[PDB]
Write an enzyme that holds these catalytic residues in place. Structure first.
Site, short mmCIF file in Angstrom:
data_model
loop_
_atom_site.label_atom_id
_atom_site.label_comp_id
_atom_site.label_asym_id
_atom_site.label_seq_id
_atom_site.Cartn_x
_atom_site.Cartn_y
_atom_site.Cartn_z
N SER A 1 0.86 -1.19 0.00
CA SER A 1 0.00 0.00 0.00
C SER A 1 0.89 1.23 0.00
CB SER A 1 -1.02 0.01 1.18
OG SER A 1 -0.43 0.21 2.46
N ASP B 1 2.85 -18.40 -12.57
CA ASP B 1 2.33 -19.71 -12.89
C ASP B 1 3.14 -20.79 -12.18
OD1 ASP B 1 0.30 -19.15 -15.20
OD2 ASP B 1 2.12 -18.00 -15.72
#
Ligand SMILES: O=c1ccn([C@H]2C[C@H](O)[C@@H](CO)O2)c(=O)[nH]1
Ligand SMILES: O=c1ccn([C@H]2C[C@H](O)[C@@H](CO)O2)c(=O)[nH]1
Ligand SMILES: O=c1ccn([C@H]2C[C@H](O)[C@@H](CO)O2)c(=O)[nH]1
Ligand SMILES: [Mg+2]
Ligand SMILES: [Mg+2]
Ligand SMILES: [Mg+2]
Lengths: 142, 142, 142
Positions: free
Chosen positions: B62, B80
């Site tokens: 953030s 992946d």
């Protein structure tokens, strides 16, 4: 399951689950003006205690850009389970791509809960011993 | 569960789980300088073999924008399961919204693992047979 | 599990699962030109009915920016389970950072399905009774 929700004050518009909404819309706690190329934390006026073992995720609505000209700088916000103190009020980090205003109660983003990832041991290795996949468009576009 | 992690070299700072972070912070593998409006692959200096059946996701912290003036161009990176080769080092794809300098070891993003979606059969249909929901702000702002 | 997929017309290139791809690539339903600092909804030429209780998520490919100079304005799109009508076609909301052409059939983003969050009771409370975590970079950077 239950989420314990504490509002900043009596003037916050309560959040709500709707039928066709898989995630739940969150709202700007106050009027907010942002300039083109300027950053601003939009307060969402809510503090929450999520069920045991859950984090929350926060993304824009798909209409957020059209209506309000902003994008979310952290892309998808992660609310840590531990962010559940009486002063841990949720925010939406905004970057305006055009001059814009947001009104109090305006639905600007959405959230859901999800189980935290499990505990996982980090095993340091010298060699992984798998063939390289590669990445960054390795599979082309056509 | 276990993740096997291979560090690019011995000068990488080891990543670590902290009690108030449901996700794990990743770190720049070298000094990076990026001019306003330029793109750079920030190498994260780690390659990993995740538990069987899992993928990973990488999002900004953030505070990434505040501290570093970058966004993540792919929003939420999907690592992946097959990207577990000896040369499959992770990266954070950054667009700078201002002149910025990132130091080796700086915690610029975070990750978690999650089960891949299940195997799915794709059945083509001529008609879905359902009422339209509509979208893109069909529910309004207020 | 089964996903029911309806293509916009017979010229759309069919989507497929690839070995090294944990999410499935979605494609532009027509040629789209976007000038730097323009927005455009890129049609994906698909509508779907997902298995009962699932939503879908849509994010860019890591190579989307390299190849096509766009970012995704809502960061990660949430496809509501209810969005399964015969005219409920998926879209990729793109903002161009440079001048680009996107060609018909080009793979520009990827999706997966996921169990929706379960039913939650929102319990209004006056005090949460927990210790404050803080956020927005409270753990620092180094
Ligand atoms: O978009 C965000 C990201 C984070 N946080 C809070 C909760 C989180 O645990 C902490 C640090 O990321 O800041 C928000 O309110 N909104
Ligand atoms: O943000 C990202 C996105 C992708 N990848 C790598 C792993 C992924 O499997 C491959 C193809 O996108 O590139 C990253 O390192 N960071
Ligand atoms: O990136 C997105 C985001 C949303 N939607 C659709 C499905 C969703 O349920 C509806 C309302 O957001 O808009 C898309 O097609 N693409
Ligand atoms: Mg909505
Ligand atoms: Mg953190
Ligand atoms: Mg891919």
């Amino acid at each position: 399951m239950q989420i314990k929700i504490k509002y900043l004050d009596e003037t916050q518009t309560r959040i709500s689950k709707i039928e066709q909404g898989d995630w739940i819309d969150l709202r700007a706690a106050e009027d907010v003006t942002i300039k083109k190329d300027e950053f601003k934390l939009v307060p969402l006026g809510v503090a929450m205690e999520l069920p045991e073992g859950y984090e929350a995720h926060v993304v824009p609505r798909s209409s957020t850009y059209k209506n309000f000209g902003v994008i979310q700088t952290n892309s998808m916000g992660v609310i840590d389970e531990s962010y559940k103190g009486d002063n841990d009020f949720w925010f939406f980090p905004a970057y305006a791509l055009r001059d814009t205003e947001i009104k109090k109660g305006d639905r600007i983003c959405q959230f859901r809960i999800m189980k935290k990832m499990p505990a996982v041991e980090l095993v340091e290795v010298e060699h992984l011993g798998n063939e390289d996949r590669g990445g960054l468009g390795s599979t082309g576009t056509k």
